[PDB]
Structure 1
Amino acid sequence: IALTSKNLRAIEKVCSDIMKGAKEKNLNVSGPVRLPVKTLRITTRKSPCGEGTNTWDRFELRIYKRLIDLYSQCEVVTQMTSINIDPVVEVEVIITDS
């Protein structure tokens, strides 16, 4: 079960949900995986006309991705995530056995 988003507070609340749900269901769960942040950037020039001092600005989009693993029913986990999820976050699922 991995998540991806653009706003860190969204992933923070989503993660805070899944640890507490896992502790409530008392099932074996891996610890919160804090992946390195991947940042997307582009530089462009202001002044649409060719006159004036050349001025450029850069942008930054760091994308938050974290991993987790659980031994639980694929149906109950997707139901709880859908209950406690927001459209901004995108989540994928993978299960373990031991």
Structure 2
Amino acid sequence: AIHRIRITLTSRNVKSLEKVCADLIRGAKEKNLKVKGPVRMPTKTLRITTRKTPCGEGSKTWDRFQMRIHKRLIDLHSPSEIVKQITSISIEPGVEVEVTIADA
């Protein structure tokens, strides 16, 4: 068989994310289902703004923290082993991964 498969990956520090994606992409085609290679999605900037005190009298000073979510997907078509294989290596830090069957 062949099954149309979508892998989404969402996570943070870049250079790791980028080379997880690299790897899914390169082994994907390399034994060529041929992807639909990493679609980089606009990275999401969570912003929090607070006064630096806990608690106030003082030049009003402000701090803003971010948390930057990065998303990608990659489109595979196959089956059995190369599915659960290609997902599961490609594993470790900091990396959410979801795989979706097809259509709806």
Which bracket does the TM-score occupy, shorter chain normalised? 0.7 to 0.9
Q: Distance in 2 between matches of 1:89 and 1:21?
A: 18
Deviation, 1:83, is 2.1
2:95 pairs, out of 83, 89, 94, with 89
Deviation, 1:51, is 2.3
Letter in 1 for 2:64: R
SS of the aligned residue for 1:71 comes to: strand
Write out the 4+ residue segments of structure 1 that deviate beyond 4 Å after TM superposition.
none
More strand by share: 2
- In the TM superposition, what whole-angstrom CA distance separates every residue of 1:29-84 from its partner, at most 9, and x where no partner exists? 21321211111111011122332211110111121001111102254323233222
SS of the aligned residue for 1:93 comes to: strand
Deviation, 1:18, is 1.1
Deviation, 1:96, is 5.6
| Bigger relative contact order, structure 1 or 2 (CA pairs below 8 A, ≥6 apart) | 2
TM-score after normalising by structure 1:
0.83
2:71 pairs, out of 51, 65, 68, with 65
Matches for 1:6-45 after TM superposition, within 5 Å: 6-45=12-51
- Over 3 Å counting, the alpha-carbon distance change for 1:13 and 1:32 in structure 2 is same
**Count of residue correspondences:** 97
Q: Distance in 1 between matches of 2:90 and 2:34?
A: 21
CA RMSD of aligned residues (A): 2.0
Q: Percent identity?
A: 68
SS of the aligned residue for 1:68 comes to: strand
Q: Which runs of 5+ in 2 are unaligned?
A: 1-6
